[PDB]
UniProtKB/Swiss-Prot annotation, chain B:
Full-sequence range covered: 27 to 90 of 91
Gene responsible for this protein: CCL5
Domain of life from the UniProt record: Eukaryota
Residues carrying covalently attached carbohydrate according to the record: S1, S2
UniProt protein name: RANTES(4-68)
Disulfide bonds: C7-C31, C8-C45
Effect recorded for T5A: Reduced inhibition of activity by tick evasin-4
Transmembrane segments: none
Modified sites of kind Methionine sulfoxide: M62
Length: 68, 62
């Protein structure tokens, strides 16, 4: 492919109910260019689910993922 | 939905090789920048104002 994707994933809504923990592969902080400072959890179906960084579960989820 | 929305913060500087273009779409209005994303697999941001962008889109529809 002569070109790689260059779109930027942003968030305009946060998932209300905590995400099934196991069904998560990675996470990443949306770009500072986006309008909302969100958290993104990548599901096993490679879906990119937006989450609120102030949420208790997200906070726990972020720390778990970065610890073997 | 509650899924990420692809937005653009830059536009490619030259026309994409036409034969590689499969489909296209206008990024959500929620995005701060208006843009057309050409799809090949790969998603390339482009300026909705350029002639080749508008013309590529016309060719695609037809």
């Amino acid at each position: 492919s002569p070109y790689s994707s260059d779109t930027t994933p942003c968030c305009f809504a946060y998932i209300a109910r905590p995400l099934p923990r196991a069904h998560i592969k990675e996470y990443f902080y949306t770009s500072g260019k986006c309008s909302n400072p969100a958290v993104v959890f990548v599901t096993a179906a490679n879906a990119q689910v937006c989450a609120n960084p102030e949420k208790k579960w997200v906070r726990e989820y972020i720390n778990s993922l970065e610890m073997s």
